[PDB]
Design a binder for these strands. Sequence first.
DNA 1: GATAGCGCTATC
DNA 2: TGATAGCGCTATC
Length: 327
Amino acid sequence: MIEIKDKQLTGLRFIDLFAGLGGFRLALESCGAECVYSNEWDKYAQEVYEMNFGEKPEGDITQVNEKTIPDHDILCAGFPCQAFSISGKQKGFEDSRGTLFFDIARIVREKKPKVVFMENVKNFASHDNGNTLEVVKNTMNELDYSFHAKVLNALDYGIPQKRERIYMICFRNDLNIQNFQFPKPFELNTFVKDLLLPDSEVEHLVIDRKDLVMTNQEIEQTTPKTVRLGIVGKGGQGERIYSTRGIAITLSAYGGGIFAKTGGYLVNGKTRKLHPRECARVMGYPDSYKVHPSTSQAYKQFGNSVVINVLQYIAYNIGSSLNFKPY
DNA sequence: GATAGCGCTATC
DNA sequence: TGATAGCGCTATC
Ligand SMILES: Nc1ncnc2c1ncn2[C@@H]1O[C@H](CSCC[C@H](N)C(=O)O)[C@@H](O)[C@H]1O
């Protein structure tokens, strides 16, 4: 994350729906706002949350009487995306995990926060010929909110990872907010190699495999793109090796493959996956963040998390628009 | 709950 | 196209 001294969101209160690791917290808190509620049902995520914020989230949002949710100004939600990702069986709203948005909508209908800040994957924008986004747009518009959205790739915001997400910022119609804008991109100056941990601490993750077919030669110049170097096995998800001179490929949560969830990188002659701390770093988490003890749950956790640095810029601009109340 | 082999889609 | 990527899917222990 980056330091932000101009704390635009200082007096505001927000809720962290679908908490996960708490990325949305970190993001908004660095901007001065305060978290009044958090919700997350996964047993392991709750533990990491508690270990890092001292609060244990409420359970199954589905059976939470919305009226119980504390008065808030910003509603943050990085709702589930198995149902819309280009990586699955795109069952959209027909999937048991694709209707959470409607849960957001009922919390919004009742509580009416000034801002709704949501996040999901790039394909949510194209899914079902854009009908899902349309349902989300029209549902939001019907509850008296403006709907702003754009696909932003993290590598354009200081983090060496190709995580293309769609961010939807919604403002209550009252506040005539007509000057919101998404952070302007900027040149990448940090690559995977800059975040790697010292070899000594990584040893146990090296994976020498005989089917390591090297398909491309290492690069001399750093590039803001994923340079694939090798393939292992048939080269499916998890069995592709990239150069530490490019940018990390999207980290995933249920991913498989020998280099499961993080992908595999060629670090100093050796082929290995990423340590949980390097995922934290590749996601923009501060090194002070306590990662969960179970490496498998840590990777799952960072896999469906969010790139803080990006949310920081957006939260900042969300704050600016709200604070422009001239006479 | 932890592991890994798979097999599909979107995008230009 | 032809090659790459993907907050994934699911069987086995
Ligand atoms: N019904 C439900 N109630 C509560 N949490 C749920 C849920 N369905 C899914 N979740 C949780 O929703 C989260 C989506 S991932 C969001 C991660 C979060 N933005 C962070 O930065 O890490 C997952 O942790 C998932 O376990």
